[PDB]
Structures are given as structure tokens and as C-alpha cells.
Symmetry: C6
Subunit: 138 residues, 6 copies
């Protein structure tokens, strides 16, 4: 089925699922990555950069798991986003050193949450072509 | 009946009710929880974090009670939110060390108030599944 | 008649009226009260808090009186808001140490003003039930 | 005729008129007056306060006169706003120590300008009733 | 023909034209002029003030010329805006010591640019009446 | 075909293409260039200035390549934007010392990304006329 799916396992919680077997349906995503134009003398690109990905999802059985990880600073052991479109896989993201840094959960005004994850290493792969990019990986 | 309900008791005021017996009908909620990506050396997660929950409700007989607690820094002894949806219980939140930190009460432009509560320990439980998360609890 | 009414007397000006006899019809109100989560060591709640109430009203014969009080830092000797709804009294607010801190008066774009009052002590009373709250009073 | 009119004379320019004889038709006004809740020890109310009135008007023959006064810091010798409504005079404002502090002139997106005036002394008078207020006057 | 026209010559580039012969059709303008209420002791009005005029225009053959002047800090030798309305000349602006300080060029979302010019001396003249104002001129 | 096209090669990645042969179709662009009015004593125009161009595009096979370059601070060896309109070439931009400084990639709320590039030298050329501008080039 078409759309955005997350495959995630916490370092202490283990596999986090919703109700693409084992994957959580994501309603929307925004990957935001910032690099200053001027690199501080002697500073690594990675330390200068800020990568965050915000996932919007229906509140579900994973919602307690994410909420706990946030407060306990639990790292995600596995974090992979796969995007399907008309049928076929389009994009695969993978992220390393993933920490949850913000959650908002809210009612209608169904129940929705926005979860923001900060990461270090990343990978994006265009499936049809096989072109991939990665930085700060392993 | 479907929707968001609060069960609350003040440490000095005692049980706070409106007109789900003993529970206050809440129109909307937003649970906002922030964790810095970089943890200050020697700082607890809890001290780095900020958890707030904002409740929107019709002004009612509890409105004076909340307004007083706010000005007197009265802690909530009990603070539990239960969310029902089509029929059935979906989610239970519990919060510890609950202090009211902001209120806005206002006319049409019926009478509505937004109440913001800061907390320390929290719990969220997905009812159907029993999956729960908690941090900084007791 | 239904709506929001103010009963106000200045310490030097005396009773301030418009054209609920002696009360000023208010179009809208917003009571905003802020309490920091962390209380500075040795600081009173009252000094940490900020209470303001903003009243929206048609410009009228009281408009010069409020405008003068603002510039002269005249305290309100009496300041009571009463809210009526369908018929019956709903809520009574009373405020102490009331100073006007901001006015905006403006044309259509009838003549309207927004008046912001800062206070110390406050009271809110739910009429039907008699439940009341107050802080920093007398 | 109904609406907002300005009567103004510059200290060096003399009488400033448009095409209520001698008065400039104003499209809109906003009188904004701010008083800090806490008065700095030994500070006059007037020095703590900020009064500004913003007038919106069609660009006209007075537009060069206001634009020049702004750049030359020319004080207004006379500055009176009169407001007429259905027929009859409603309100009279008078301002002292009037300096122009901001102009924006702009095309359709007819030709319009917003002019912001800072003042010290002020007066507002409700015509029908004769109730007046003033502060920091002469 | 009605509207806003610019006559401009760069100090090094010479005359800058588009496709009112020799004048560039401007879609919109905003002249923004700021004067602080308090003049720093010993500071000229001109140094305290900030005058900027923002011109919105279709991208055209002048677009490279303005873009270059911006990066090279080239002063405009001539800068005159004339505004025609129903037929007849309404207003003439002239500006001295004109430097381009910001450009945004952008696609539909035809090709449009917003160009912001900072100036020192200025003049505005109401044509029908001949009333003029100027400050900081020559 | 009409619209905005990018021709780009990374210094390490080589040619970056999508699915105007070899050019990437761009949905929208915004070239933003800022020059302070006051040039710091002894500072070059280039160091005072900030030039950025933001490109909006469908996520595609180039998306991994741009995302990697961003994190690795890879400079673009070639960066040329060409704009076609009704049929014919309108504008050519060229940029030097191009670094990617920000990306946002996001879902519908197809898959879209906004990519912000900072540059030093630039050129813009109006094709029909041949008028060109450039600063800080080679």
C-alpha cells in the first residue's frame, strides 16, 4: 500500500509497532538539515550540522513507547523510513544515533502526534535508480 | 460518552469537579514534551526536559478552583486524563508533581479557558493493548 | 440582559460609567495569569506571577476617564466584572491593586478600545454553585 | 460629514492641509498608550509611558509636508483630531509635543500612507457628555 | 499611461532601462522612513533616521544591472520616481546617496523582483499643487 | 519546454541529474541577496554580503546526491540556472563557490524538497538583450 512507513526498534524498549508488517504508517514527514555557511575553525561538519526529522502519525499503541523513550533519552537501535508511491518503493531513509527530542500529542480541534527525532548519520536511497547518499555514517 | 475527561484533586482544595461521574469534560488537549539533543554534563534528563499539558474547557464551577490553585502554587494530588472513542477507553495519562503555570479565560469573540499544567513524572497507557510508558515516576 | 459588565471606580476620578445600572457593557474579556514553574528562592508567588485582564469595549464617555487614569497611574478603587448568560449571573470577578497598563483605541478598518489592567489580588466566584477562588487578596 | 479629521500646523511649515474646512480627512486611527506596571524608582510616569497615534490617509498635498517634518524633526505646533458620527461630534483628541516618528507610503497591491506620531501631553473629550481626560498637559 | 515609473542611472553602469521613454514601469512601491523619538545627544537627524524604498517590478533587462550594483555597492547617480494617475502626474520622488541593500528575485508560486534601496537625502513633490518637502538634500 | 532548469555538478559527486537534457526541472526559485547599508571599515563587499538561492523541486534521483553534499560540505563545481518562457531563453544565472546550507524534504500535507545554496560570485544575463551583471566573480 502507498505512503510512508517507519521501522523502529528502541535500544531498551525493543521493536515499536502500531496496530508493511511491523511498520508504522506515518501521515507526514519533514526532514530538515542545516549546515552553517561558515564552518568554525577545527569543527567537524557533523558537529556544525543539525539534522531533525519530524513524523506525524495517529496516536496508537506505539505512542506510550515513543513518549517514554523521549523522557528516558533512549536511543533508537533501528530507524528506517520507506516511502511507497504509484505500488512501488520510491525512497529509503536510514538514520543513526536517533534520539527523540520533542513530542506533541493532541486531540481534534482523530488523536495525532508530531514526533521530532534528532540524528547524526543518515542515508537516503532512490530505489528505482539505486542512487544513494550518506554522511557521518557508522 | 466519547471524549477527554480529567480526574483531578488539589492538595489543599480537594476534589475539583464540573457540573464519567466526578470527571471534567475537556474540549481539547495538547501534551508538549521537550528534550534537548545535548544533555548538559551531570544534568538529569528530568531537569533538562520540559513537560506541559494544555487543557481547553468550558468555564464552569471548577474555574475558580483552578484559578486559585494557579496563584497559590497548589500542587495537584491527583491528575489523570482518560480518552474515550468509538464507546471504549483508548488512552490513560497520569501526571505527577502537577503545577498550574498559565491560565487564559475568555469570552466569545461560550466562555472558555485554556489551562497549562507543568509536570515531572508521567505515564501514558494504550488501553486495548496495555502497552504503557512512563518516565521520572514516583 | 446577557453579557459582560464592569463596575469600576477610580481612586481620584470616582465612579466611571458609560451611557445593569452604573455598569459598563464589555464586548469581550481575556483574563491571562502566568506563574513560572520554578519559583525563585525567597520570592513570593505574587511577585513571580503576572495577572492581566484585557477588556474590549465601545469607545464612550468612560473612554477619556480610562485614558487619563492610564497616564496618571491612578489605581482603581473598585473593579468588579459580572457575567450574565442564558437571564442569570454566571461569574463574578473582583480584582485588587488594579492599574491600567495599556490602551489601544481605534476606528473601523464602530470606535473600539482594548484596555489592559494589571492586578495583584483576585477573586472568581461561580454564582449558581457558590464555589470561589482567590489569591493575594487584601 | 462623518469620520475622522486632523487639524495640524507645523512649528516651521505652518498649516498643513489636504485638497471641515482646513481639516485633513483621516481613513483610520489607532491611539496606543503603554504604561509599565512597575514604575522605576524616581521616574516620572511620562518618561515611563509611550504614547503613539497612527493615522492612515490618502496620499495628497500634505504628504510632502509630513515627509519633510519627519526628516527634520519638526514639532507640530497644533495637533487636534475630531471624530464625527451618526451628524454630530463624538470625540476630540489633542496632543502636545508631537513628533512624527514613522511614515510608510505605498501604492495599491489608491496611494496610502500610515503616519506614526509620538506625543507627550494628551487630552480626550467626549463631546455629548463633556467628560474629558488629560495627562502630562502643558 | 498611469502608474509608477523609475528613472535611474548608476554611477558606473550608466542609464538602467527596461524593454515614459527610458523609464522602468514599477508594479508597487513602499517608502518607509523611521525617526527615533529620542535623538541621541550630538547625533544628526540623518544619522538617526533610516529611509528605505522597496520597488516591486517584473524581472527584465535591468534585472542584471541592479543585481550587479547590489554586489558592487554601486551608488545610483540619478534616482527619480514619478507617479501618474487618472492621465496626470501626481507625485515626484527624488532620492540621494542611493545604495541597493536587498534584492529578492523569484518565480511564480511571472518573474518578479523586490529591490530595496537605502538613501540619505529625499524630496517629494505634489505636482498639481507644487507643495514639496525635502530633508538632508545635497 | 518552459520553466526553470538547473545544471549542476558536484566537486566529488560529479554530474547530478533527475529522471533540456541533463538539466533538473525546478518548480520555483528565490534568489535573495543582502548588502548592509553601512560597510564595516576595511571589510570587502563580498564578506559583508549574503547571497542565497532557494530551489523548490520534486524529490527524485538527485535528492540523495544533494542530501549527501549538504552533510559533507561538498562544493558544486558547476551551478547554472536557465529560465525559459513564452519557447525562448529569458535568463541565465551562474553561481560560484556554491555550498548547500539547508534542505527540507517533505511529504504531501507529491514529495517536495526546498534546497538553499549559499554562494560567492554570481552572474545574471538577460538573453534577448545580452545585458549581464556579475560580482565577486572568479
Amino acid at each position: 500500500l502507498a505512503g510512508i512507513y517507519l521501522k523502529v526498534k528502541g535500544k531498551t524498549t525493543g521493536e515499536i509497532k502500531g496496530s508493511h508488517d511491523g511498520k508504522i504508517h506515518i501521515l507526514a514527514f519533514k526532514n530538515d538539515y542545516d549546515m552553517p555557511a561558515r564552518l568554525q575553525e577545527g569543527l567537524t561538519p557533523a558537529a556544525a550540522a543539525r539534522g531533525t526529522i519530524t513524523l506525524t502519525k495517529e496516536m496508537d499503541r506505539s505512542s506510550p513507547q515513543f513518549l517514554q523513550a523521549l523522557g528516558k533519552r533512549e536511543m533508537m537501535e533501528e530507524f528506517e523510513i520507506t516511502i511507497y508511491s504509484p505500488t512501488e518503493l520510491l525512497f529509503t531513509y536510514k538514520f543513526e544515533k536517533v534520539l527523540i527530542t520533542h513530542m506533541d500529542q493532541y486531540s481534534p480541534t482523530g488523536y495525532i502526534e508530531e514526533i521530532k527525532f534528532t540524528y547524526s548519520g543518515y542515508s537516503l536511497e532512490h530505489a528505482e535508480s539505486g542512487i544513494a547518499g550518506a554522511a557521518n555514517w557508522k
